[PDB]
Amino acid sequence: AESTLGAAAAQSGRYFGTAIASGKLGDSAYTTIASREFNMVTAENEMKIDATEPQRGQFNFSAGDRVYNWAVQNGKQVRGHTLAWHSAQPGWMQSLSGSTLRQAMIDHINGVMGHYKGKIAQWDVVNEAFSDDGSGGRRDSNLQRTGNDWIEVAFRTARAADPAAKLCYNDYNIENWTWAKTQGVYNMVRDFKQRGVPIDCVGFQSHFNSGSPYNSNFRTTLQNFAALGVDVAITELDIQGASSSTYAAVTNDCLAVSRCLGITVWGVRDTDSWASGDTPLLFNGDGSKKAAYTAVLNALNGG
């Protein structure tokens, strides 16, 4: 198979996934498409820090588990999103600094990975640690202010919390090979591999739009990262305007890189998108397949 995105991807040993929102699981038209077309699931919001540890030292896994349980009951693997992030921090964590913040970050990783131990294919361990200011450096977050080694520490912590999970660094605007942000990440990952820091994968969010357009040098990005000795994944794909050719291009970029694990689109239907006005996904609000759907499917079936 052949007739659905997930099955097409699996012929080449890859997955095609989607972001699932827990609020939409009571929507039958939504779950019909999602169950049929995808073999990988990411929780859109339910596995973030404020979702899982909204109070200090007390974990809340209900919504996360609702997504996880739906995925597993419908034959999907799951990517965890996300363990350590400057954004969406609960009030109690935002207040913390230094060694106390560092320990909270560690304890969060242990609690969330511990709960899902063995159940999660890939974790976005660190998310969005690089600046968009053009310097190619780290954000000045509370996390970064604990010390530059925070990311390395997060990764070593996560390895011990669930040895079976692939550990991913996830970011956006790191797809264009010529961008400073891209190079800053490439240089961190290279350093990590030289020093034996346990990163298994780099996730390329792949939000393509007018402020961050697709460039054919994406394949070069993927190839260069892969050659460092990591896997690569496309984690949050959407394309402003949903051009068929751009969707096919992105697909063929992944298919061209053997260490490209698969592609996750960030939503099922245009209506489900964080950018619904951009109609950037593979299905319309009424559940019909867009032209891009066919382009992606043909590319996956084309090997």
Side-chain angles (χ1 to χ4, degrees):
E2 203 71 11
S3 295
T4 63
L5 301 172
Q11 293 296 307
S12 64
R14 292 178 178 95
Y15 65 75
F16 210 95
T18 187
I20 292 296
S22 54
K24 277 160 200 293
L25 292 173
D27 191 334
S28 52
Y30 174 92
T31 48
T32 292
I33 294 153
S35 187
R36 183 184 73 239
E37 301 283 351
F38 306 104
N39 53 9
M40 178 75 75
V41 166
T42 301
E44 195 163 351
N45 294 287
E46 297 79 7
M47 292 190 206
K48 294 170 175 183
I49 306 180
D50 60 351
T52 48
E53 198 180 2
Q55 119 175 260
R56 189 168 181 181
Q58 300 302 126
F59 292 91
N60 177 352
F61 295 115
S62 297
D65 287 352
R66 174 161 193 215
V67 176
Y68 168 78
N69 288 334
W70 180 88
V72 147
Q73 290 165 26
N74 295 270
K76 290 104 187 69
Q77 295 179 306
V78 177
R79 311 189 68 265
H81 182 68
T82 173
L83 297 169
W85 194 17
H86 76 276
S87 291
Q89 288 188 354
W92 69 263
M93 182 182 278
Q94 294 164 359
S95 300
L96 300 185
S97 61
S99 56
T100 300
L101 182 53
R102 179 63 69 76
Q103 201 54 41
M105 171 193 81
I106 289 165
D107 295 342
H108 187 72
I109 289 161
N110 289 338
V112 179
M113 296 195 70
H115 175 84
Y116 290 110
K117 197 179 180 177
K119 302 180 183 332
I120 305 286
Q122 284 163 66
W123 271 104
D124 298 327
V125 179
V126 181
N127 200 43
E128 299 179 8
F130 279 72
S131 182
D132 296 308
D133 67 0
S135 65
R138 301 276 187 98
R139 288 174 191 278
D140 181 35
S141 58
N142 63 347
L143 294 166
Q144 181 61 18
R145 276 171 250 137
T146 65
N148 199 63
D149 64 353
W150 74 271
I151 299 191
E152 165 184 354
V153 166
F155 275 95
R156 286 211 202 279
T157 300
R159 171 70 85 231
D162 186 0
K166 297 190 157 80
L167 310 179
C168 186
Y169 177 76
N170 193 52
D171 217 331
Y172 64 94
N173 289 177
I174 59 161
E175 298 85 25
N176 191 322
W177 184 238
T178 66
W179 282 27
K181 190 180 188 185
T182 305
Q183 294 304 314
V185 175
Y186 177 85
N187 287 333
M188 175 184 75
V189 174
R190 190 215 255 139
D191 180 43
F192 279 9
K193 293 297 299 198
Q194 284 169 345
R195 295 191 295 102
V197 175
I199 174 166
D200 304 317
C201 181
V202 175
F204 297 87
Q205 282 188 23
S206 304
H207 296 295
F208 298 115
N209 50 52
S210 64
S212 191
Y214 171 78
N215 189 294
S216 56
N217 75 23
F218 192 34
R219 203 178 290 202
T220 303
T221 298
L222 294 179
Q223 280 162 350
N224 271 273
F225 274 91
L228 290 180
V230 297
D231 296 321
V232 297
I234 287 152
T235 51
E236 307 191 15
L237 178 67
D238 42 42
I239 296 161
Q240 187 185 44
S243 162
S244 272
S245 55
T246 309
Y247 260 111
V250 170
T251 301
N252 290 310
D253 292 338
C254 185
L255 292 176
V257 179
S258 67
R259 285 170 176 169
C260 185
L261 302 179
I263 290 169
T264 288
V265 298
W266 210 237
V268 180
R269 302 161 308 182
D270 286 344
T271 45
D272 313 312
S273 181
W274 69 278
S276 58
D278 285 338
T279 49
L281 294 173
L282 300 172
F283 291 89
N284 289 303
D286 69 16
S288 61
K289 292 165 184 191
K290 293 160 76 184
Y293 178 97
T294 304
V296 170
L297 185 64
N298 294 357
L300 297 168
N301 279 329

